[PDB]
Amino acid sequence: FKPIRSKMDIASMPLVQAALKEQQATKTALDMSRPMFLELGRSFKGAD
Amino acid sequence: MQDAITAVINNYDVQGKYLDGAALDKLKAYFTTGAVRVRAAAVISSNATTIIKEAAAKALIYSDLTRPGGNMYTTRRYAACIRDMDYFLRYATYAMLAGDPSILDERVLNGLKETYNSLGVPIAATVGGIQAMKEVVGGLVGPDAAKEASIYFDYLSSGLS
Amino acid sequence: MQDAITAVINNYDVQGKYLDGAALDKLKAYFTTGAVRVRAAAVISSNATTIIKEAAAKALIYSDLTRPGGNMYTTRRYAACIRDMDYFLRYATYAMLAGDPSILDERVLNGLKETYNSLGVPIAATVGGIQAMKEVVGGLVGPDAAKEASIYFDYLSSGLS
Amino acid sequence: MQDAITAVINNYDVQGKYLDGAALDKLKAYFTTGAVRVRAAAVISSNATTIIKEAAAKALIYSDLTRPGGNMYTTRRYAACIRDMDYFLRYATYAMLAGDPSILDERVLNGLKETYNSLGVPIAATVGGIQAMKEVVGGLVGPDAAKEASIYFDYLSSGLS
Amino acid sequence: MQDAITAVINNYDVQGKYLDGAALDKLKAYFTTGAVRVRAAAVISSNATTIIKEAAAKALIYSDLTRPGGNMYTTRRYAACIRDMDYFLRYATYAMLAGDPSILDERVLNGLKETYNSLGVPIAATVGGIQAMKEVVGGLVGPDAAKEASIYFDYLSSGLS
Amino acid sequence: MQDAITAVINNYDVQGKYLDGAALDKLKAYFTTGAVRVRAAAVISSNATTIIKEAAAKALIYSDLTRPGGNMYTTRRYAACIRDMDYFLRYATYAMLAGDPSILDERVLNGLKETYNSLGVPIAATVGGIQAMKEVVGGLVGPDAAKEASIYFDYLSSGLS
Amino acid sequence: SVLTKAIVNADAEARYLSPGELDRIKSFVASGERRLRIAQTLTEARERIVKQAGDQLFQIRPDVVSPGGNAYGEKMTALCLRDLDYYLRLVTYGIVAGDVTPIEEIGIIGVKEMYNSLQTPIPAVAEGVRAMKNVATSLLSGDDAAEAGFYFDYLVGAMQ
Amino acid sequence: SVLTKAIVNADAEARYLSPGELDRIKSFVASGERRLRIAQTLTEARERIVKQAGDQLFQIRPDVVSPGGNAYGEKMTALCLRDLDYYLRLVTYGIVAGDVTPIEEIGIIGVKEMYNSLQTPIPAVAEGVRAMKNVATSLLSGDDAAEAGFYFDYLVGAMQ
Amino acid sequence: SVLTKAIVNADAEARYLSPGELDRIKSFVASGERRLRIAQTLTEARERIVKQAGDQLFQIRPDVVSPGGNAYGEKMTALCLRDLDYYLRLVTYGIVAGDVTPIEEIGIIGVKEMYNSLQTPIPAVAEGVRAMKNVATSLLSGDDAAEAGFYFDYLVGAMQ
Amino acid sequence: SVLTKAIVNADAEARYLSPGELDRIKSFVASGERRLRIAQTLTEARERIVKQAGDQLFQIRPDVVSPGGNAYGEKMTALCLRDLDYYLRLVTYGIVAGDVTPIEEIGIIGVKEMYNSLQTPIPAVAEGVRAMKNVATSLLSGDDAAEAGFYFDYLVGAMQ
Amino acid sequence: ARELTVTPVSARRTTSPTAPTAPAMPLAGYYSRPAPRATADGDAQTKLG
Ligand SMILES: CCC1=C(C)/C(=C/C2=NC(=C\c3[nH]c(/C=C4\NC(=O)[C@H](C)[C@H]4CC)c(C)c3CCC(=O)O)/C(CCC(=O)O)=C2C)NC1=O
Ligand SMILES: CCC1=C(C)/C(=C/C2=NC(=C\c3[nH]c(/C=C4\NC(=O)[C@H](C)[C@H]4CC)c(C)c3CCC(=O)O)/C(CCC(=O)O)=C2C)NC1=O
Ligand SMILES: CCC1=C(C)/C(=C/C2=NC(=C\c3[nH]c(/C=C4\NC(=O)[C@H](C)[C@H]4CC)c(C)c3CCC(=O)O)/C(CCC(=O)O)=C2C)NC1=O
Ligand SMILES: CCC1=C(C)/C(=C/C2=NC(=C\c3[nH]c(/C=C4\NC(=O)[C@H](C)[C@H]4CC)c(C)c3CCC(=O)O)/C(CCC(=O)O)=C2C)NC1=O
Ligand SMILES: CCC1=C(C)/C(=C/C2=NC(=C\c3[nH]c(/C=C4\NC(=O)[C@H](C)[C@H]4CC)c(C)c3CCC(=O)O)/C(CCC(=O)O)=C2C)NC1=O
Ligand SMILES: CCC1=C(C)/C(=C/C2=NC(=C\c3[nH]c(/C=C4\NC(=O)[C@H](C)[C@H]4CC)c(C)c3CCC(=O)O)/C(CCC(=O)O)=C2C)NC1=O
Ligand SMILES: CCC1=C(C)/C(=C/C2=NC(=C\c3[nH]c(/C=C4\NC(=O)[C@H](C)[C@H]4CC)c(C)c3CCC(=O)O)/C(CCC(=O)O)=C2C)NC1=O
Ligand SMILES: CCC1=C(C)/C(=C/C2=NC(=C\c3[nH]c(/C=C4\NC(=O)[C@H](C)[C@H]4CC)c(C)c3CCC(=O)O)/C(CCC(=O)O)=C2C)NC1=O
């Protein structure tokens, strides 16, 4: 039996693809549950 | 077969790579949609019979297909056809849970086009039976899950044509 | 440098012409707006520091620019940037008094684009710092002077871009 | 310029990171080799003139380079060439003490390739003069320091070619 | 082919001369009429079909030419003739844009006189068809462009006679 | 083939949708990167031969591949291999201009894996030849264009493996 | 570092390092594992030295967290405690470098001009910086506490 | 597009794009935002353009909505305006592509044979298409109205 | 030119030119005044560009002016700079037209065969052209220097 | 071979071999033992022949083995003699085949493109081959030396 | 190739040598080398015409 391949990358699917956009937003953009002084001196980028 | 998660693991295994940031992002994109996939499967499973009934009613019966000379003439063939319909529905539900179409190739599409050519089974009519079940499914499962269920019905139908 | 009045004198001098009706009309058009230019300069000068503060607050700080990796990170560079801002404000006030942009070319724009490219100074961000000071200035100086002050800020900013 | 202690600080400052374990390990890797760097510098400094003499003797003079038509013909140019040699030796000794090549870029290599093209100074011949001084240096400084001195001579020579 | 500008470049290239004052004056004389050429082409192009229709009506049809024994008798030959007319109009529009008749020689006139002699195509009648399209064109394009369009129609017509 | 502007149209046409806000945003995302794509293509085209030479030098020659028994042994096969390399480079430049990989499928990848299996052409070695040209390209085209050029080389190489 | 400062003098006089300069690099690097260890205590307690500093600072001068005070409010205070976190970080950098080069370029050269603009009261800030010494120093052995203390007193010195 | 039309010339001669070809891609793409605005305006008024086109059409030729007319009746009319909606859509596609490739494959090649079969009167249809130009053009600035107008006149041309 | 190229493509299709093609020509006309000016500037400094190009070349490739080198000797070097003068001239032509056109017919089609016969190393001619770019480009404003630079890089490209 | 060449022409014209074609096969095969002896002698002295070609080459072109030369250095020279060993081998093949089919597919078709990429000066490879002719020819009788010489001059010809 | 490169004087310009760590041998003669004005006996008679 010939082995099949895959023609749709799995992160191009709708549910997964939109949960990845949301994942980005949260880490970069925003703060948390630790004291504000610690969050106010953070660099979003890391090496640039 | 493979799912979202094993698709990634095997793609990295052949390169012998530990999972990196790009991989981890893909897996998150699956996990984050997971609860919704489960709810959608429970709706489809529990409405299975009604989906087939409404899909056949819109796209198959009341027609030449069911009247002497037609491929779903005889109780014998009518039963085989809605049996098939149940396969499609059931496997599409697997593909959508897995978030990967590979099972639809391995266990449903492989050789099926020619099997249908050999028996005389009308391909175009079968596709309409698939796209009618999709229509019903998309109503029942709601905004959350509609697009995700839909794609594996579309995978099935471009696999035959 | 030149102002409204010497712009006209030098334009006629190269032709060796005594001032004629067209010249005299231009000079009147300057003199007739003169008192308003003076009042506007006294508002800008005496609010200098507040204009920079409000312009930086709307267009520069609370951002990646002031964070590590940003060009106005370090007290050194933050100081250099608002130092620059003061130059712009001060010279625009000269240009507006003179009613001629020539001083903005001779003593501010010449070589500045490349100086900023060579140091890495972000041009687009600097323009926003200019157009924010204009916004503040136009409120403080009032109907009389708003359009006239504004143009030399616009001269500055299209001089960089 | 920067040195190993300083580079660790500026590399982390741009990320706004406290020095962490990885940083502290790097700095240790410098401090732990520090005493050996000092001893090596004292050997090079105090043998400076002999190193140049032996390096020139193996790689420059007794040749067409020192004959009419050659770039180190004339007492003027012979003096300029061994003057250069002293720069290289001296700066490589700085780089090796600092444990960072950045000074070799800032104060030696920048523009030097084209400066030599413009005067006609033979690049390949100058590299041999560098790699001959390295050879001598590596004998004089001993097992402790040989590899560490050597790299900044190699930095210099791939900076020209 | 060549236009105004390449006519000058090739005339100097064969002498290996950089462009001098006389050359630069010629090129200016072209550039300074350029915008007008473009507007004229847009009028001709967009009225193409009407120009042919009015030119045929004044100079070809309602005649022995369209009657049995005539060269534009038969729908075949009538079609070939107004097809030709479209070529002339279209190429003259190219020549006028280029400000050079060389394209009219290379791609239209070369061999055409004898081609028409060989088929029996009436030359004098074809010239009238050209000079009628010129008449229409000169009305439509206006004072700005009339003389400039006209010359390449005149080039075409003395190329046949 | 299709390009970003064209793909947006055909993707909407099959749904019979006017271009809407989401579509218009996609097209903007292409147009806004367009000037940079052009500059990058002009660098690649004009350095074509040097990119192949440096890519072969890092990833193909000085090896068993070029020795008797190797697939790029014989001037015939060496010529065929760097001929291929030029195809890849050239088409990747098309894909990157178009902002769509569809041309790489239609005119390069389709059947190529099996063609190489049938001739014995080493696939893994060819991928390294692709990823070496990418490395060179990314240096030559600069920050502006590096990521965008790179992806279509990566498209090519996962198309073979 | 000591190097960045110990080489700059060499290059400026066009010469190789002195026996003295070599000796101090020697002694300095020998104190590496230990200096690394004093800077690890301080990162452990990074947010707790800072919180404790904040309190001491406002007793000795509260007015800054009052109607007409530069640090009045929850987010005008978040910024203030954040600046104290910045300077503690720079102090850990200085201790591991063995001089101020890094501390200086990052947070004292230009600091007068920055804070004058913000009209943060700078001299209150020196006292705030001083408080951190008191807390940090109570989490270190006598010998390590002194070594740390020099860098705190430097910032206090510059700052004003 | 301009790209599709042009690259095709590159590949067919086995070569990279010319300076000329590169220049036109650059000039073309610079004219992008404007073309996108022209499509937006027209997309935004599609229902008005179609309806007013349909009135303008039936005055200039009503007989089609009469006993022996191809578009006689409510659902035979629901189809004629729908076809007018189709062509306006294709016109927006053409404007953003900068040529007709898409317009052509979708709705002119084969159109004679389609409409001859339906015995829709095709030449009435050209006039109907022309009416849309008149409406659409009244919702665009002079410069944008001309740029749009070329694509309307193309469709009018191809149905011929 | 830009004109010749546009037209030739038009005539091949046997249809009048387009109305966005009436865009490249329009751009070229505005560009031409600037283009004419750049060529004049290049023409003024021709002797300096050639000579300094020739020094830059022989440093980078001394082998061509050596015993077994194509340009070895005083009059084998004189002809070499004359060829560099030829190509600078063609570069001014290319800039002014707005399209490379004539330069191709004058100095690249057949150039491989010519120089192979003379045994001239082609890639070192390409270097001589890069050298001229460097000199010429230092006598032009940033914007004009780039516009000129495209034509230098073309010639460098064609000798390949 | 002579066989392959004769046959291919036969089959392509759909016919049996000509008297001429048959005659040349006969004359060719009669020279078999002689041709085999010519290949043996040269195979037996291969290492010497390359060493003397390589000396003759570097005298005539000391530049190739000079700073900006393709064969500059010990391992850029090692590969150069290896290429000379390759071509001598192909020359022995050609002599025993009685034509170039094998020589051609293995080492001239594609050779311009290969060496242009590597930037190897082709005409100095042709010189290396002349140098091998001179050495090889001094180890063969007059008659055999001529027969060998044709194949050397062919390779020299094809690199052109 | 060692021999060719090394083991051989090769062609540079012309000429060589005599220099560090050093030298070559073809012998010499003090009143052996011919003086440069340089030549003949009988050039003198024959030179003129
Ligand atoms: C020759 C073999 C054969 C049989 C028997 C057959 C029956 C058959 N009965 C049908 C419907 C039907 N059949 C019935 C029959 C009944 N309703 C009742 O309550 C009674 C119990 C019963 C009458 C005695 C009804 C009411 C429908 C319509 C059901 C629907 O449309 O949902 C249909 C779908 C309509 C169609 O497309 O024709 C088929 C195919 N088809 C076949 O090929
Ligand atoms: C035209 C300007 C000019 C001068 C003068 C010059 C001199 C010069 N003398 C040299 C060596 C030398 N020169 C001498 C000379 C002497 N030994 C003694 O004890 C005596 C005091 C003296 C003879 C009167 C010696 C012995 C060496 C060899 C030194 C060595 O190889 O270490 C060398 C290195 C060998 C070489 O590569 O040529 C140079 C360049 N170069 C120049 O470009
Ligand atoms: C502080 C860092 C620094 C460096 C390294 C430096 C190099 C340098 N070398 C120079 C010249 C030179 N450099 C050399 C060097 C050599 N000649 C040879 O044949 C050998 C291959 C080589 C010695 C190994 C010569 C001969 C000149 C003189 C060129 C002339 O006559 O103008 C000059 C021109 C100004 C002058 O003549 O002093 C500079 C600036 N300048 C600097 O500021
Ligand atoms: C034997 C092949 C052949 C044909 C058929 C032919 C037709 C023909 N019809 C013409 C005009 C015409 N033909 C018509 C015909 C009609 N008007 C209508 O509306 C009706 C649809 C149609 C009558 C059934 C009209 C009205 C004109 C005058 C048009 C004008 O002058 O602009 C003319 C131009 C007048 C002339 O010079 O004769 C020609 C040549 N010529 C030929 O060589
Ligand atoms: C691209 C440049 C170009 C031109 C201009 C061109 C002209 C041209 N005109 C032709 C015939 C013709 N040309 C005409 C023209 C006319 N009949 C009249 O009575 C009038 C006087 C005149 C129109 C005003 C006619 C009637 C024929 C057909 C002759 C035949 O029946 O064979 C033919 C013979 C092939 C054919 O029939 O198409 C050519 C090539 N070909 C070209 O490639
Ligand atoms: C049997 C058919 C055949 C031939 C002939 C062949 C030649 C060949 N010559 C090569 C390199 C080379 N060949 C030379 C040859 C020369 N340098 C000079 O200047 C002289 C003109 C010449 C010696 C006479 C040199 C110097 C290199 C190294 C070039 C480089 O590495 O860039 C290489 C790349 C290195 C490798 O991977 O082997 C190949 C494949 N390959 C083949 O399959
Ligand atoms: C337009 C798109 C297109 C592509 C890409 C293409 C590839 C292609 N490569 C081929 C052969 C080949 N391809 C190679 C390639 C290589 N050899 C190696 O060892 C390396 C790993 C690699 C170069 C990096 C070689 C050596 C052959 C010759 C095989 C033979 O001797 O038959 C052939 C067989 C016909 C021929 O020999 O030309 C095709 C069609 N054809 C196309 O139409
Ligand atoms: C590493 C070198 C460095 C430092 C130190 C630095 C400080 C700095 N402090 C800021 C604000 C601030 N800083 C403070 C600090 C205080 N308020 C008080 O009353 C107290 C005296 C003090 C706390 C001890 C406050 C309240 C603000 C907000 C001011 C405003 O938003 O107007 C801002 C603007 C907000 C931002 O965009 O980040 C910067 C850049 N930036 C730097 O690059």
Task: Let me know: does D34 contact G27? Beta carbons within 8 Å.
Answer: no
Task: Enter the DSSP assignment of I62.
Answer: G
Angle in degrees, CA G122, G127, G133, rounded to 5: 130
Residue E69: strand, helix, or coil: coil
**How far, in Å, CA of G136 to CA of G50, rounded?**
9
**How far, in Å, CA of E99 to CA of E155, rounded?**
12
Could you give the domains of chain I? 1-160 (1.10.490.20)
List all residues of chain C from 78 to 137 with a beta carbon under 8 Å from chain A.
none
Angle in degrees, CA F35, F39, F45, rounded to 5: 140
Of I34, I76, I49, nearest to I139 by C-alpha is: I49
What residues in I contact E19, CB-CB < 8 Å? 39-40, 43, 92, 96
Q: Quick one: CA torsion of K37, K40, K44, K49, rounded to 10 degrees?
A: -110
Residue B65 burial by Cβ neighbours in a 10 Å radius (0-12, 13-18, 19+) = buried
Q: Token pair for residue I122?
A: 């082609």
Q: Quick one: CA torsion of C81, C83, C85, C87, rounded to 10 degrees?
A: -140
Spatial neighbors of C23 by CB under 8 A, at least 6 apart, are C8, C12, C17
**How far, in Å, CA of I35 to CA of I91, rounded?**
11
**How far, in Å, CA of I26 to CA of I21, rounded?**
9
Spatial neighbors of J25 by CB under 8 A, at least 6 apart, are J2, J3, J6, J17
Task: Let me know: does F41 contact F96? Beta carbons within 8 Å.
Answer: yes
Residue I148 to chain F, least CA–CA distance (Å)? 14
Of D32, D55, D29, nearest to D138 by C-alpha is: D55
Residue F59 to chain J, least CA–CA distance (Å)? 14
List all residues of chain I from 59 to 118 with a beta carbon under 8 Å from chain E.
86, 89-90, 92-93, 96-97, 101-102, 106
Q: Which helix (H) or strand (E) holds C80?
A: helix C75-98
Angle in degrees, CA E155, E156, E159, rounded to 5: 85
Residue K6 at interface with chain J, using a CB cutoff of 8 Å:
no
Spatial neighbors of I124 by CB under 8 A, at least 6 apart, are I57, I61, I64
What residues in G contact D39, CB-CB < 8 Å? 22
Residue G80 is labelled as binding a ligand = yes
Tokens 């085999």 correspond to J36
**How far, in Å, CA of I42 to CA of D6, rounded?**
49
Of E25, E16, E103, E102, nearest to I93 by C-alpha is: E16
User: Count of F–J CB contacts within 8 Å?
Assistant: 35
**How many CB atoms sit inside 10 A of residue B16's CB?**
6
**How far, in Å, CA of G88 to CA of G82, rounded?**
10
Task: Enter the DSSP assignment of E106.
Answer: I
**How far, in Å, CA of B30 to CA of C108, rounded?**
56
Q: Token pair for residue C28?
A: 């009147």
Q: Token pair for residue G84?
A: 């104290």
What totals of helices (H) and strands (E) does chain H contain, helices first?
9, 0
Resolution (A): 2.8
Which phi-psi region, left, alpha or beta, contains residue J44 (left: φ > 0; alpha: ψ -120 to 50)? alpha
Task: Let me know: does G44 contact G136? Beta carbons within 8 Å.
Answer: no
Give the HSE-up count for residue F153: Cα atoms under 13 Å, Cβ half-sphere.
Answer: 23
What residues in A contact B30, CB-CB < 8 Å? 10-11, 16, 19
Tokens 């098939």 correspond to B84
Question: Which residue type, as a one-letter code, is found at position E109?
Answer: L
The CATH code of the domain that includes F126 is: 1.10.490.20
Q: Token pair for residue F10?
A: 């055909």
Which phi-psi region, left, alpha or beta, contains residue F74 (left: φ > 0; alpha: ψ -120 to 50)? left
Of I116, I155, I120, I149, nearest to I135 by C-alpha is: I149
**How far, in Å, CA of H42 to CA of H47, rounded?**
10
Task: Enter the DSSP assignment of F17.
Answer: P
SS3 content of chain J, % helix, strand, coil (to 5): 75, 0, 25
Task: Let me know: does I6 contact H27? Beta carbons within 8 Å.
Answer: no
Of C108, C89, C153, C116, nearest to C1 by C-alpha is: C108
Ligand 1 centroid distance, CA of B61 (Å): 10
Query: Distance of CA J83 to CAs F20, I87, J111, Å?
Result: 64, 37, 12
Of G100, G7, G99, nearest to D95 by C-alpha is: G7
Positions of E strands within B74-135: none
Q: Token pair for residue J83?
A: 């290429």
Angle in degrees, CA H108, H109, H114, rounded to 5: 80
**How many CB atoms sit inside 10 A of residue B106's CB?**
14
Helices A14-29 + B146-160 axis angle, to 10: 140
Of C45, C131, C46, C159, nearest to C94 by C-alpha is: C45
Q: Token pair for residue H143?
A: 């410069």
Give the HSE-up count for residue D110: Cα atoms under 13 Å, Cβ half-sphere.
Answer: 7
**How many CB atoms sit inside 10 A of residue H118's CB?**
11
Tokens 């009389």 correspond to C144
| Pick among I9, I24, I26 to test the H interface (most H CBs inside 10 A) | I24
Query: Distance of CA E31 to CAs D85, E4, H38, J110, Å?
Result: 61, 9, 32, 49
**How many CB atoms sit inside 10 A of residue B74's CB?**
12
Ligand 8 centroid distance, CA of C93 (Å): 30
**How far, in Å, CA of B33 to CA of B4, rounded?**
11
Residue range(s) defining the domain that contains residue C100: 1-161
C-beta atoms of G28 and D34 within 8 A: yes
Spatial neighbors of B46 by CB under 8 A, at least 6 apart, are none
Give the HSE-up count for residue J64: Cα atoms under 13 Å, Cβ half-sphere.
Answer: 25
Of the listed ligands, the closest to the CA of J110 is: 6
Task: Let me know: does H43 contact F18? Beta carbons within 8 Å.
Answer: yes
SS3 content of chain D, % helix, strand, coil (to 5): 75, 0, 25
Q: Kindly calculate the radius of gyration of chain G based on its CA atoms and give it in whole angstroms.
A: 18
Question: Which residue type, as a one-letter code, is found at position G113?
Answer: E
Spatial neighbors of F103 by CB under 8 A, at least 6 apart, are F1, F91, F94, F95, H7
Of H73, H60, H35, nearest to H130 by C-alpha is: H60
Question: Which residue type, as a one-letter code, is found at position H15?
Answer: R
Phi/psi of residue H147, nearest 5 degrees: -50, -40
Q: Which helix (H) or strand (E) holds F138?
A: helix F123-141
Annotation: binding site of E: 62, 66, 71, 74, 76-77, 81, 84
Which phi-psi region, left, alpha or beta, contains residue I14 (left: φ > 0; alpha: ψ -120 to 50)? left
Q: Which helix (H) or strand (E) holds B107?
A: none
**How far, in Å, CA of G99 to CA of G3, rounded?**
9
**How far, in Å, CA of H39 to CA of F20, rounded?**
9
Which phi-psi region, left, alpha or beta, contains residue C44 (left: φ > 0; alpha: ψ -120 to 50)? alpha
In chain D, the number of structural domains is 1
Of G50, G44, G43, G38, nearest to G135 by C-alpha is: G50
Q: Token pair for residue F33?
A: 């990167």
**How many CB atoms sit inside 10 A of residue H132's CB?**
26
Phi/psi of residue I110, nearest 5 degrees: 100, -5
**How far, in Å, CA of K38 to CA of J155, rounded?**
49
Phi/psi of residue C158, nearest 5 degrees: -85, -15
Residue J80 is labelled as binding a ligand = yes
Alpha-helical (H) ranges within chain F are: 4-13, 21-31, 34-59, 75-98, 102-104, 112-119, 123-141, 146-160
**How many CB atoms sit inside 10 A of residue G8's CB?**
16
Residue F11 at interface with chain J, using a CB cutoff of 8 Å:
no
Residue F3 burial by Cβ neighbours in a 10 Å radius (0-12, 13-18, 19+) = buried
Of B104, B109, B108, B151, nearest to B131 by C-alpha is: B151
